[PDB]
Each structure stands twice: as structure tokens, then as C-alpha cells.
Design a protein around this motif. Structure first.
Motif, PDB file in Angstrom:
ATOM      1  N   UNK A  43       0.858  -1.181   0.000  1.00 30.32           N
ATOM      2  CA  UNK A  43       0.000   0.000   0.000  1.00 30.32           C
ATOM      3  C   UNK A  43       0.897   1.234   0.000  1.00 30.32           C
ATOM      4  N   UNK A  44       1.381   1.584  -1.186  1.00 33.51           N
ATOM      5  CA  UNK A  44       2.279   2.720  -1.319  1.00 33.51           C
ATOM      6  C   UNK A  44       1.514   4.027  -1.149  1.00 33.51           C
ATOM      7  N   UNK A  45       2.168   5.002  -0.532  1.00 33.25           N
ATOM      8  CA  UNK A  45       1.564   6.302  -0.286  1.00 33.25           C
ATOM      9  C   UNK A  45       2.022   7.314  -1.327  1.00 33.25           C
ATOM     10  N   UNK A  46       1.168   8.276  -1.680  1.00 36.01           N
ATOM     11  CA  UNK A  46       1.576   9.318  -2.633  1.00 36.01           C
ATOM     12  C   UNK A  46       2.692  10.211  -2.111  1.00 36.01           C
ATOM     13  N   UNK A  89      13.928   8.249 -12.487  1.00 34.96           N
ATOM     14  CA  UNK A  89      13.903   7.383 -11.314  1.00 34.96           C
ATOM     15  C   UNK A  89      12.883   7.819 -10.273  1.00 34.96           C
ATOM     16  N   UNK A  90      11.862   8.573 -10.668  1.00 32.38           N
ATOM     17  CA  UNK A  90      10.833   9.035  -9.748  1.00 32.38           C
ATOM     18  C   UNK A  90       9.529   8.319 -10.058  1.00 32.38           C
ATOM     19  N   UNK A  91       8.894   7.782  -9.020  1.00 34.09           N
ATOM     20  CA  UNK A  91       7.659   7.047  -9.207  1.00 34.09           C
ATOM     21  C   UNK A  91       6.543   7.989  -9.655  1.00 34.09           C
ATOM     22  N   UNK A  92       5.684   7.535 -10.570  1.00 33.37           N
ATOM     23  CA  UNK A  92       4.594   8.404 -11.033  1.00 33.37           C
ATOM     24  C   UNK A  92       3.526   8.642  -9.983  1.00 33.37           C
ATOM     25  N   UNK A  93       3.416   7.782  -8.974  1.00 34.25           N
ATOM     26  CA  UNK A  93       2.419   8.003  -7.935  1.00 34.25           C
ATOM     27  C   UNK A  93       2.884   8.979  -6.868  1.00 34.25           C
TER      28      UNK A  93
ATOM     29  N   UNK B  97      -6.942   8.031  -5.381  1.00 39.66           N
ATOM     30  CA  UNK B  97      -5.972   9.121  -5.347  1.00 39.66           C
ATOM     31  C   UNK B  97      -4.676   8.745  -6.056  1.00 39.66           C
ATOM     32  N   UNK B  98      -4.278   7.471  -5.996  1.00 37.50           N
ATOM     33  CA  UNK B  98      -3.087   7.046  -6.725  1.00 37.50           C
ATOM     34  C   UNK B  98      -3.283   7.246  -8.220  1.00 37.50           C
ATOM     35  N   UNK B  99      -4.446   6.850  -8.742  1.00 32.04           N
ATOM     36  CA  UNK B  99      -4.731   7.075 -10.154  1.00 32.04           C
ATOM     37  C   UNK B  99      -4.799   8.563 -10.467  1.00 32.04           C
ATOM     38  N   UNK B 100      -5.422   9.340  -9.579  1.00 31.27           N
ATOM     39  CA  UNK B 100      -5.522  10.779  -9.786  1.00 31.27           C
ATOM     40  C   UNK B 100      -4.150  11.426  -9.908  1.00 31.27           C
ATOM     41  N   UNK B 101      -3.170  10.939  -9.152  1.00 27.61           N
ATOM     42  CA  UNK B 101      -1.829  11.504  -9.243  1.00 27.61           C
ATOM     43  C   UNK B 101      -1.051  10.979 -10.444  1.00 27.61           C
TER      44      UNK B 101
END
Lengths: 190, 138, 435, 32, 55, 492
Positions: A43-46, A89-93, B97-101
Motif C-alpha cells: 500500500x504505497x503512499x503518494x 527514477x521518480x515514481x509516477x504516484x 488518489x493514486x490514479x488521480x496523481x
């Protein structure tokens, strides 16, 4: 069709010719997979990364240090490499409202260095990208008109100068730029 | 012109070749981001479409097709969210929110990647003589 | 108010172009006229546009009666409609239809049960269904033309069509009648050219075919054409007062005040009233031959009333009766002018087009006079609208009397009504902008 | 609910049925 | 007598159509009137022998 | 019961009068029955024969009526001729002869087959078109391409041609070809290349692309996109002139030049005024044509295409002297149509009379009446465009806060080119002798056209300066267009 690698876990379309949108989707999914491989938590966080930010900041400061030593050749390489790593190297989320301002802050320094060095076309392209991505400031139109005059494009330069004066008509540089543009265009036609 | 079919193709491939588990989640995120992008696009284009229709410059069937796409996009997003919940339990409040970003992030990445091809078309259009180091040699 | 699933045509979501609207008007009009030419199967009117013995026997009478009743109950303020909602309007429009259909039911049932078709069941139900389908078709067609596919309403259009058709038939009728002397055409130009070709006596045939004391002639055609052109010229009369907006500054325009201010109804009411009073005088004199008051109010003889009030109020047919008794002529003229004038005043007072209502509309919209104050709009409309309406009514009356004395092919009221219906379309097409 | 073409088609159908019934009755009386 | 005075005042203040505008007006109205009249006349005429033959 | 004509005694007169009623008015009507264009002659002198042949390839009723009337009148004149007896004029065999079922079967046929089929065909034909004048499928394709259009991709000429290659009206003309074929033909047309065998199709699609490009421009303005509109105007210019879009194009649109000589020899001339800076013989020596009789044609063409120039530009509202919040003003342009040979005349020489607006109610009620009194624009110089076209100026306005088009584009056609006539040839640029103090120089002879654009949207409810951008481009030449900004001083 599409092939799936075993050890690297990259998906590639084994077709002879592939459409463009399909290829972009393939690259996006491959980037997402490579990012999920590195990111451990299910469950990765933004919330953005920290070590990557430290590396980006270190590369940026090492590039900026060459300005004090007045080496405008390797500084450009360093800032370009930093921007490349930030984009790769940066995650899109990760947080958009935090990934965008850092990109802008690095791109402005890159643009200033590229203009000071003598490269004008890359400077114009970066200026147009930064303007179309949602940053409108009088500090951009000045460099845009300067570049367009340096590469002999007077109509677009005049249009951009007029648009800049239509936002901050209290500028003292935009007016001189407009005067030079009018003179150059009058010599261009007359 | 979508990635909705690609997710199903990946699912059919996984059902036979025993591919990794994260690729399905990645394709799911991709389809969700595409659905979010299309929904926002329709929400921002609806007034202009309605204006053109009222002006009588678009036809009669395209307006119905557009209103139909409005709800087909919602149905697709609902199916995608249902599939996401089926794939991972209790992963709906964060998936949104993950998809939104990732939508905005991938849009920005594509916009930035386009500049390398955008740099040569202006060269071809304005007949620049650019040597190495990007300088002009007239 | 109730829930009803009735056949109704949906309005176009977008504005219909002018060419398609014209084509739809033409085709629906052709359908309406063809429907009025077909007789029924199992068988063995001038003012309501109907003909006996055809599928159009009922005609538009149910629609016109329902519309009149609804307008009357709306004028008496019993429905309490509010324009703030878009639901009670649809409720009124569906009430239109649900009353029209039951009126058709009643009229068809009474005509099939009492009409001269015959008391004897399959034939009866078939003849009922024929009229039912005809009435539903004509009502649906009027609804279609009114929804936006047509230039305007359907009832006025069909009335104008019947007027033009009767006018053309009074001149180009190929029907012949042989009464002793020979076969003669019932048309003007037809018999004219016929006598010009076959008689081979120009000096005599010309005057013989130009007078035609018994049948329509070329003189009547010239007279009706002249009155037609005069009415057409009298349509452009208008008072445009300069107006400006105050809420949204910079909207400059004009408010036109046409001469024929009313919608041509007051003359119709006057004609109906005089016809009713004439027939009532005839009936009463027939009932009471001699009486101190009946002999004074009206006397009838060779029918035609003579030496009575009905004799005074009866219209003049030709110039002979005009030059016969100038007193009767002048009193008839004064009566028909005063009555039409007061009817026009009452109509502008009742129809909500009073200068007070116009001033309230200006105050709501914010429009004011260009070179005057805002507290003077009503005081200025009082000095314009009443006089204009009265003079327009008087001119309409004068045109009607002139048409009746000159003996044109049709009544002047019909001519002015048709020209009004057509001028509405012309002005709409000019204002909107189209080919 | 009802399109204008539907109105035209139904009207022409009604007229055609009426005239067809008339002509059938006429030819039936003429032949029989 | 004020009636006729106010009437002629309104007439003088009115806007009579000129020849160029009246020409288009009469052209359009006459075209429409003739178009509807010929339609009515033809429909009334053609259906007489048809009504005789049919009925 | 009626009594038909049984001895042919009444129907001849009826037919005769019915025929005269039609032939007479026709005979009567038959017996009854501003802008200098300098290119109308020189266009046919440079047009190729392959296009002339294409443009070339792609009352008796009165007489027959009169002879019929003569026949009928002769037939009538050759004839021999109590209760009422009504009768009809129609002949007797028409109802009682052997062709009695013939009339009713023809009537029922005309009522059941001819009317509904033709009405449905006309309806389906008028429904498949848009109010602009294009097919519905073409507009649907345009919209579907514009909606899923990546803003990252830049608009070029090739992209717009690729979009045009999917027009549904191109398939109806030739159901054999493909969109790629249309793209190839359009590329060969723009690059002045021969198709070999499908030139008659290339010319047709080029002539049809006009309304297509106008519809595309309308849709692009509907979606509030400026780059696509600019690309559309540029592609229209490129198609009408048959030239690829280059920086030095105002000189390549000329009829007779050589690129392999001009491009390789000179590298600084890019406009028309810069070209006129050189002398009359140096121009020919640079353009490499060395033919005086042929140099005259190009020198007369290069000095007669319209260039614009602003004199006064500001917002006007009818009935007021300033702009107020939530008011409905319009844009009033005072332009000066000039050629690339005349020098610049100062704005102060304008007598200030032609720049003012008349203050009268009939003039402020509809301020476009004075603009609609200007003469039309002459025929364009397009020796490669198949048909004959007039000039056109597409004026479109955008906003300066974001850069989005906020209204449909206005296309004006009325303008006075009096300033381009050959009478005012003394006003040349190479004289450099202050031609304003000339014996023939009269500021009252120079005409100042006007352009008025309705804004379509009210002023904002706030109070302040709000900048706009109006763009007035040509549609036939590559002249100097107008690109100016203006701000409305909403002051209340």
C-alpha cells in the motif's frame, strides 16, 4: 501482440509495426512495473521519496557550484543529468504538487545557463514547455523574446512581447524589447 | 485508441504463462489513470460541445454519441474499480488518489518527452543551420 | 393535472433552417388540402374552414373551440398559471390535447348518431374511425407546424389557404352553367378569354365580359388586386420609438408600433354581432307581424329588411344602393367605423397590450425612451398607443366597407387576414435572416 | 415521441387505405 | 375634432415604406400568395374527376 | 351530376387560357429583361492549360407555349359555335373512356411512390449536411480528431492535410481511392507535382477543400484553440498559392521565380518590401528571369496584393462614450490597405474626420450598415487553384490571460482597394524624397477602410483593464497581417 520478459519483467510488443499510443502505453506500464519492483510496501503512499530527493539536490548543488567557479560547460551537463534522473527514477504516484515545482526550479536554472552559454533553440523549447505547463511570469516572456530575436523570428517575438506587456505593463525591459522588435521588423519589411 | 484492451490482453496472458503479479496491478493503474483523464476531458469539453451543438455546426447524432460516452466512461471506471477491489482487498480508497496523481504525472512526462521531437520540426520549418553545440552558423 | 402518455411530437433541439421549414410547411399544407378532398366510404362551414361529405367535415373546429375555451378560462383568471415554472406550461399544453380529443369524440358521436348518413354497425364504426383518424391527423399536423417545423401556427395558415383558394376559384373556375342563352364559365378570366376568342365581336364581347352583372368579371379582379396592393402598402406603417437599455448599457434598438395594432379580431366580432342582430330582427319580425315597437325596430320584405333598423345596418352590395339613399349609406359607414374603433380600443385594453402593461414591461426589462425620462414612459405611451390603435381599427373598417361596396372577389376581412398571416411570415424571415 | 416522417407516413397510409377501399368497392360493384 | 388631428399627427410621425422596400415586400407577399393559391386551385380541381371515377 | 364536354366545345378554351396565363408573364419578364480588379486579365495569362481545360470541362418553353396557343385558337375558331345545367370543362373520355382506371392508377402512384420516396431522399440529403455546408461524417471526424489531440504534438501543414484526408466528401467523389491517396495528391498539389493520371481528381479535391478548411477553422474556434486555427489559415494560404510553408514564402508565391537560383544566391530577402527596396533591374537580376516583358508581369503582381496597417483600434459601445461593466461593446478597426511599394504615411496626416463615428440614432442602432457599404475584394491571383476565388480576411479574437479563442471567426469580404490603383504610382519607396510634400499627394484621396467585429460576449462585471488579442489574417496571399493587442478600460 506483445512479449513478456522473464528475468527483467519488461513487456515488449513483438509485432513488426506498432501504433504510437500503444507504444506509449507499453512504456508507461513498463515504468510502473519497474517502480513497483523497487517500491516494497504493497500500500504505497503518494508521499514522495527522500533519498531520490537528496540525490537530486546533491546533483543540482554540484552543478550550481560550477557557476561560482564559472564553468558553464560541465554545469549544464550536471543540471541536465539531475533533471534526467528526476524525470526517470521518480515514481509516477508521487505527489504532483511537489514534483512539478522542483522540476520548474531546476528548469529555470537550466534555461538561464543555456541562454548564457549560447544555445538558443533548446532554451526556446524549454521556455515554451515551462510556459505551456502552467507557469506564466514576466521573467519568462523576456527570455522568450530575446531568444526569438537571437534566432531571427520577429512575428512570434512581437506577439510574445505584447502578451507579456498585457500582463505586467510596468516592465522596463519588455518595453525596450518591444522597441527593438519594432525596429527590426521595420527593417525586415522596409 | 485506449489501454483498456491491453489490460485484458495482459490478464489473458497471465492466465496461461504465469507472469508476475505486479504487471496486472500496473496495467490496472494505467487503465484507471486513462479513465480519469478521459472523464476530466469530457467534463471540461461538455460546455464547448453543447455550444457547438446549439450553434448547429456538429450534427444530430454526435451529441447523442457524446452523452452516451459520458456514461460509458463512468461504467468503465466503475468496472475498473470493481476489478481493483477484486484484485486486492481494501484497496479502493487509495487506488482513487493514486490514479488521480499518476494521471497528471504521466501527462507531464509525455509533455516533457515530446520536446525532443518538437525541437527538430521547428528546425525543418524555419531552415536553421545549427552546427554542433547548438549554436547558429547562419 | 394527471399523468398521460399521449402522442406528441418533440420540438427540435436546434433551430430549424428556413428552407427546411418552408418545405415542411408546403408538404403539410398539401396533406391538409388533400385530406379535405376525399369523401367517406359507407355514406349513402365557411368561417371554420370545413366542407360537408368529406373526411374534413369536422375540420379544425375541435382545435379552435378548445383553444378559444382555454383562452377564455385563462383570461378570466381561473387557472392561476405562473410563468416561473416549466411544468404548468406543459400541463396547459396537454390539457389542450386532452380536451380536444374528447371534443372530437363527442362531435363525431353526435354527427354519426344524428347525421343524415343513416341509422343502420360495421359501417357505423368504420365511419366513426375515419373521422377519428382525420381529426387526429389534422391536430397532430397543427402541433407539428407549431412546434417549430413550420413558419407559424396551422389554423391561421389553413384559413389563409382556404381564402386564397376561394379567391382563385372565383376567377379561374372551369365549371360551366347553361341557362337558356348558352354555356358560360363561372370564372372571370376564363369566360373573358372564351368570349374574346369565340364571339368574334370585340366591341360587344369586351363590355359583355367586363360587366357580367350575374357572374364575377374582370372589374372585380382589378378591384380586388388594387385593394390587395393598397393593403400591402398599408402594412409597412409603423411608429418606431427610440429605446435604450439601462441594466445592460449599449443595447440600442427600436420598438415598432404597427398601424393594424390588433390581430384583426374586432372586425370579426363586429360582423358576428351584426349578423346575429340581423337574424334576430328577422326572427322577431316573423314572429310578430305588426306591433308599435316591432314595426319601428325592423320590417322585412322583398329576403331583405326595409324601413327598419335592420334595414339601416345591413351592408351595401353595390353602388346603386349607395347612390339610392345617402342617409342609410352615411349612417352605416359611421356605425361600422365607430363600432370597429371601440372594439379595437376594448381589445387592446383586454388583451394585455395596454400602455400600462407596456410601461410595466419596460420597467421590468429596464428599457427607457432615448430622449426622455423614465418617469414619462407611461405618460408618453398614453399619447401614442390609444390613438394608433383607434386609427388602425378605423382604417381596417374603411377597407372592409370599400371592399364590400366595390364588390371584390372576396370579403375585405379575409383579404386583410390572409395578408396579415403572410406578412407575419415575411417579417419573421426578414428579421431572422434567410433566403 | 413521434417524428415528422412518421406523421407523413401515417397520413399517406390513411389516405391510401381510404382510396383503396373505395376503388375495391367500385370494382366489386362493377364486376359483381 | 381632435381625433383627426392626432391621427394625421401620428401619420406624419409614422414611417412609410419607400419604393425599394415596398418592392421587396410586395414581391415576397405576392409570391407567397400566388404559391398558396395555385396549390389550393390545383388541389380543388384535380380531385373532381378523381372523385367522379372513384365514387 | 356534372356534364363533361362531349363534343370538344369548352375544354380547348380552358386549356388555352391556362397556357396563356403562364406564357404571357414569361414573355413580359423576358421582354423587360466598384472595385478595380487588375488580376482578372493577368490570371488567364499565367494559368496552365491543364487547369484551363479542367475549368472549362468542369426560353423554348415560350415558343412551344405560343405555338400551342396558336393551335388551340385555330381549333376553336374552326368550330361551328328554363332550368340551370351545371357542367365541367374537362373532356368526356377522361372519365368515361377506356383510360378511366389509367388516371386513378397514375394518381395513386404519384401519391404513394413519387412523393414519399422523393421527400425521404431530400430529407436524408438535407440532414446529412451541417449548417456550415459540410457532411456530418466530416464534422464528426474533425471533432473526434480535435478532442483526442495531444497538446504536446505541434500542428504543422502535414498534420492538417492528414486530418483533411479523412473527409467523407472525398470518398463520395471517388469511391476507389483511399485517404492515403488523397494525402499523396494534396502533397503533390502543394509541392507542385504531377499525379500523372488522377489530376482531374486532385483538382476536384483541391477545389472542395475550401469549405472543409473553413469548417475545420470553425470547429477549432469552437474548441477554443489558437494554434490549430493559425495552422488552418496557414494551410489555406499554402493550398491557394500551391507552395509549401517556408520562411521566405512571400517571394515564392510569385508567379515566375526559380528556387534553385533565388535560394542559393540570396539569403536575406524574405518579405515584399525588402524586395521592393532594390531597383527595377536589380530585382530581375536577383530573381533570375532576365526578361523585361516577363518581369513586368511579376512587378505588377508584387505591387498589387493587399497589405494591412492599423490607424486606430479601440473598443466601441453603441450609445455611450466609455465601457461599463456588463456592457456589450464591439471592436472597431481603422485599417489602411497598402502595397509593399508605398512608404509609411504618418498617422498625424489623417484629418481626424475619417476616424470619427457619426453620432446619430439611425447610425448607432446598427453600426455595421456603414461597413456593409464597402465594395467587394477583387479576384485573387491563384494560377494554380482550379476555380476563381475572391479575397477573404478571417478575423478572430482571443484572450491574453490564457491564450484561448473566445468566439467563432468572422470572415469579412467587403473592402476598398483604391489605394492599390496605378494612379498613385508616384508614391514609391525608392525615391526617398519625402513624397508627402508632393504636388499629387492629397490625404483626402487615400481611402481608409473599416472593420467592425461583434464581440458576442459582454464586458466583465469587474472594473479594470482587460487585454484581448485580435488576429486578422489573409486567406489568399502571404502578406503582412495584423497581430495587435488591446485592453478594455472598464470604468463604470
Amino acid at each position: 501482440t506483445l512479449e513478456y520478459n522473464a528475468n527483467s519483467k519488461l513487456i515488449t510488443a513483438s509485432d513488426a509495426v506498432v501504433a504510437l499510443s500503444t507504444e506509449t502505453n507499453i512504456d508507461q506500464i513498463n515504468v510502473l512495473t519497474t517502480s513497483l519492483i523497487g517500491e516494497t510496501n504493497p500500500n504505497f503512499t503518494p508521499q514522495p521519496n527522500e533519498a531520490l530527493s537528496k540525490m537530486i539536490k546533491g546533483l543540482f548543488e554540484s552543478g550550481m557550484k560550477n557557476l561560482q567557479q564559472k564553468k558553464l560547460n560541465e554545469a549544464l551537463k550536471n543540471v541536465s543529468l539531475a533533471i534526467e534522473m528526476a524525470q526517470r527514477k521518480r515514481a509516477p504516484w508521487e505527489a504532483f504538487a511537489i514534483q512539478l515545482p522542483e522540476l520548474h526550479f531546476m528548469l529555470r536554472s537550466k534555461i538561464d545557463l543555456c541562454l548564457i552559454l549560447g544555445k538558443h533553440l533548446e532554451a526556446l523549447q524549454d521556455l515554451d514547455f515551462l510556459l505551456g505547463t502552467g507557469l506564466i511570469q514576466p521573467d519568462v516572456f523576456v527570455r522568450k523574446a530575446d531568444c526569438l530575436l537571437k534566432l531571427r523570428q520577429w512575428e512570434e517575438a512581437r506577439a510574445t512581447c505584447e502578451r507579456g506587456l498585457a500582463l505586467a505593463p510596468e516592465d522596463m525591459k519588455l518595453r525596450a524589447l518591444l522597441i527593438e522588435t519594432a525596429r527590426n521588423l521595420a527593417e525586415y519589411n522596409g | 485508441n485506449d489501454a483498456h484492451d491491453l489490460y485484458f490482453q495482459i490478464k489473458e496472458m497471465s492466465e496461461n504463462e504465469k507472469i508476475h503479479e505486479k504487471v496486472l496491478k500496473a496495467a490496472l493503474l494505467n487503465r484507471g489513470a486513462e479513465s480519469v483523464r478521459r472523464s476530466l476531458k469530457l467534463k471540461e469539453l461538455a460546455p464547448q460541445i453543447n455550444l457547438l451543438y446549439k450553434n448547429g455546426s456538429i450534427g444530430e447524432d454526435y451529441w447523442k454519441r457524446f452523452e452516451t460516452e459520458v456514461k460509458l466512461i463512468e461504467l468503465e471506471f466503475k468496472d475498473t474499480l470493481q476489478e481493483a477491489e477484486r484484485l486486492q482487498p481494501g484497496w479502493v480508497q487509495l487506488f482513487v488518489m493514486v490514479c488521480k496523481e499518476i494521471c497528471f504525472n504521466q501527462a507531464l512526462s509525455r509533455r516533457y518527452q515530446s520536446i525532443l521531437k518538437r525541437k527538430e520540426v521547428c528546425i525543418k520549418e524555419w531552415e536553421l543551420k545549427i552546427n554542433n553545440d547548438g549554436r547558429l552558423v547562419n | 393535472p394527471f399523468e398521460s402518455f399521449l402522442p406528441e411530437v418533440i420540438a427540435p433541439e436546434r433551430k430549424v433552417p428556413y428552407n427546411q421549414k418552408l418545405i415542411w410547411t408546403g408538404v403539410s399544407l398539401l396533406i391538409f388540402l388533400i385530406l379535405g378532398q376525399i369523401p367517406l366510404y359507407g355514406i349513402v362551414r365557411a368561417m371554420l374552414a370545413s366542407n360537408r361529405g368529406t373526411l374534413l367535415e369536422l375540420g379544425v373546429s375541435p382545435i379552435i373551440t378548445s383553444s378559444l375555451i382555454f383562452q377564455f378560462l385563462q383570461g378570466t383568471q381561473l387557472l392561476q398559471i405562473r410563468p416561473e415554472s416549466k411544468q404548468d406550461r406543459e400541463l396547459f399544453q396537454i390539457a389542450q390535447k386532452v380536451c380536444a380529443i374528447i371534443l372530437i369524440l363527442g362531435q363525431a358521436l353526435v354527427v354519426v348518431m344524428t347525421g343524415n348518413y343513416g341509422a343502420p354497425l360495421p359501417i357505423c364504426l368504420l365511419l366513426i374511425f375515419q373521422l377519428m383518424f382525420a381529426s387526429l391527423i389534422v391536430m397532430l399536423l397543427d402541433e407539428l407546424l407549431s412546434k417549430g417545423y413550420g413558419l407559424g401556427s396551422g389554423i391561421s395558415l389553413f384559413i389563409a389557404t382556404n381564402i386564397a383558394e376561394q379567391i382563385f376559384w372565383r376567377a379561374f373556375a372551369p365549371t360551366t352553367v347553361n341557362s337558356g342563352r348558352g354555356k358560360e364559365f363561372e370564372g372571370a378570366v376564363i369566360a373573358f378569354f372564351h368570349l374574346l376568342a369565340v364571339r368574334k365581336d370585340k366591341k360587344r364581347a369586351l363590355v359583355e365580359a367586363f360587366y357580367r352583372t350575374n357572374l364575377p368579371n374582370m372589374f372585380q379582379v382589378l378591384m380586388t388586386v388594387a385593394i390587395f396592393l393598397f393593403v400591402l402598402y398599408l402594412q409597412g406603417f409603423r411608429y418606431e420609438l427610440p429605446i435604450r437599455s439601462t441594466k445592460v448599457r449599449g443595447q440600442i434598438g427600436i420598438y415598432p408600433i404597427k398601424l393594424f395594432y390588433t390581430s384583426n379580431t374586432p372586425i370579426i366580432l363586429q360582423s358576428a354581432l351584426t349578423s346575429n342582430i340581423f337574424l334576430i330582427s328577422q326572427i322577431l319580425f316573423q314572429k310578430y307581424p305588426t306591433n308599435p315597437l316591432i314595426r319601428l325596430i325592423g320590417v322585412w320584405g322583398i329576403q331583405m329588411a326595409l324601413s327598419g333598423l335592420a334595414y339601416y345596418i345591413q351592408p351595401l352590395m353595390s353602388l346603386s344602393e349607395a347612390l339610392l339613399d345617402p342617409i342609410k349609406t352615411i349612417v352605416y359607414i359611421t356605425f361600422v367605423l365607430g363600432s370597429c374603433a371601440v372594439f379595437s380600443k376594448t381589445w387592446i385594453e383586454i388583451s394585455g397590450t395596454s400602455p400600462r402593461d407596456i410601461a410595466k414591461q419596460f420597467k421590468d426589462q429596464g428599457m427607457v425612451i432615448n430622449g426622455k425620462r423614465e418617469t414619462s414612459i407611461y405618460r408618453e405611451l398614453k399619447k401614442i398607443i390609444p390613438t394608433a390603435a383607434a386609427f388602425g381599427g378605423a382604417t381596417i373598417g374603411a377597407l372592409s366597407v370599400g371592399s364590400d361596396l366595390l364588390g371584390t372577389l372576396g370579403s375585405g376581412a379575409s383579404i386583410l387576414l390572409a395578408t396579415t398571416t403572410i406578412y407575419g411570415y415575411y417579417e419573421a424571415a426578414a428579421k431572422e435572416g434567410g433566403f | 415521441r413521434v417524428d415528422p416522417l412518421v406523421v407523413l407516413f401515417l397520413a399517406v397510409g390513411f389516405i391510401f387505405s381510404v382510396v383503396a377501399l373505395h376503388v375495391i368497392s367500385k370494382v366489386a360493384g362493377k364486376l359483381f | 375634432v381632435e381625433f383627426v388631428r392626432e391621427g394625421t399627427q401620428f401619420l406624419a410621425k409614422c414611417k412609410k415604406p419607400d419604393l425599394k422596400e415596398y418592392t421587396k415586400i410586395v414581391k415576397a407577399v405576392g409570391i407567397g400568395f400566388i404559391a398558396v393559391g395555385i396549390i389550393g386551385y390545383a388541389i380543388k380541381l384535380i380531385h373532381i374527376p378523381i372523385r367522379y371515377v372513384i365514387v | 351530376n356534372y356534364e363533361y364536354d362531349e363534343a370538344s366545345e369548352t375544354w380547348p378554351s380552358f386549356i388555352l387560357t391556362g397556357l396563356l396565363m403562364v406564357v404571357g408573364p414569361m414573355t413580359l419578364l423576358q421582354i423587360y429583361q466598384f472595385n478595380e480588379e487588375v488580376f482578372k486579365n493577368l490570371n488567364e495569362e499565367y494559368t496552365s492549360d491543364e487547369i484551363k481545360q479542367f475549368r472549362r470541362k468542369f426560353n423554348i418553353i415560350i415558343i412551344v407555349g405560343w405555338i400551342l396557343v396558336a393551335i388551340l385558337l385555330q381549333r376553336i375558331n374552326s368550330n361551328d359555335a328554363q332550368s340551370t345545367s351545371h357542367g365541367i370543362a374537362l373532356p368526356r373520355f377522361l372519365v368515361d373512356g377506356s383510360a378511366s382506371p389509367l388516371l386513378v392508377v397514375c394518381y395513386v402512384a404519384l401519391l404513394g411512390l413519387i412523393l414519399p420516396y422523393f421527400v425521404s431522399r431530400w430529407w436524408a440529403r438535407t440532414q446529412s449536411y451541417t449548417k456550415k455546408g459540410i457532411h456530418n461524417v466530416t464534422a464528426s471526424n474533425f471533432v473526434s480528431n480535435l478532442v483526442n489531440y495531444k497538446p504536446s504534438e505541434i500542428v504543422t501543414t502535414d498534420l492538417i492535410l492528414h486530418w483533411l484526408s479523412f473527409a467523407h466528401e472525398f470518398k463520395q467523389f471517388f469511391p476507389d481511392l483511399q485517404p492515403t491517396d488523397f494525402e499523396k495528391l494534396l502533397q503533390d498539389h502543394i509541392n507542385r507535382r504531377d499525379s500523372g493520371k488522377l489530376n482531374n481528381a486532385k483538382f476536384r479535391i483541391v477545389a472542395k477543400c475550401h469549405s472543409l478548411l473553413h469548417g475545420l477553422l470553425d470547429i477549432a474556434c469552437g474548441f477554443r484553440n489558437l494554434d490549430i486555427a493559425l495552422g488552418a489559415i496557414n494551410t489555406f494560404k499554402c493550398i491557394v498559392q500551391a507552395v509549401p510553408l517556408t520562411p521566405n514564402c512571400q517571394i515564392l508565391q510569385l508567379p515566375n521565380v526559380d528556387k534553385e537560383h533565388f535560394i542559393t544566391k540570396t539569403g536575406d530577402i524574405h518579405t515584399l518590401g525588402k524586395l521592393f527596396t532594390l531597383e527595377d533591374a536589380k530585382i530581375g537580376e536577383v530573381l533570375g528571369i532576365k526578361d523585361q516583358a516577363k518581369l513586368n508581369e511579376t512587378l505588377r503582381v508584387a505591387s498589387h496584393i493587399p497589405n494591412l496597417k492599423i490607424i486606430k483600434a479601440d473598443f466601441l459601445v453603441p450609445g455611450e462614450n466609455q465601457v461599463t461593466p456588463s456592457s456589450t461593446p464591439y471592436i472597431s478597426l481603422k485599417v489602411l490597405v497598402r502595397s509593399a511599394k508605398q512608404p509609411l504615411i504618418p498617422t498625424s496626416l489623417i484629418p481626424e474626420e475619417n476616424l470619427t463615428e457619426p453620432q446619430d440614432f439611425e447610425s448607432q442602432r446598427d453600426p455595421f450598415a456603414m461597413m456593409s457599404k464597402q465594395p467587394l475584394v477583387p479576384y485573387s491571383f491563384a494560377p494554380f487553384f482550379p476555380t476563381k476565388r475572391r479575397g477573404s480576411w478571417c478575423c478572430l479574437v482571443s484572450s491574453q490571460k490564457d491564450g484561448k479563442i473566445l468566439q467563432t471567426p468572422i470572415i469579412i469580404e467587403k473592402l476598398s482597394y483604391k489605394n492599390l490603383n496605378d494612379d498613385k504610382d508616384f508614391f514609391d519607396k525608392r525615391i526617398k524624397m519625402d513624397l508627402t510634400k508632393h504636388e499629387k499627394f492629397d490625404i483626402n484621396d487615400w481611402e481608409i477602410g473599416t472593420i467592425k467585429i461583434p464581440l458576442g460576449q459582454p464586458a466583465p462585471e469587474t472594473v479594470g483593464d482587460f487585454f484581448f488579442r485580435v488576429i486578422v489574417k489573409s486567406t489568399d496571399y502571404f502578406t503582412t497581417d495584423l497581430d495587435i493587442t488591446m485592453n478594455m478600460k472598464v470604468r463604470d
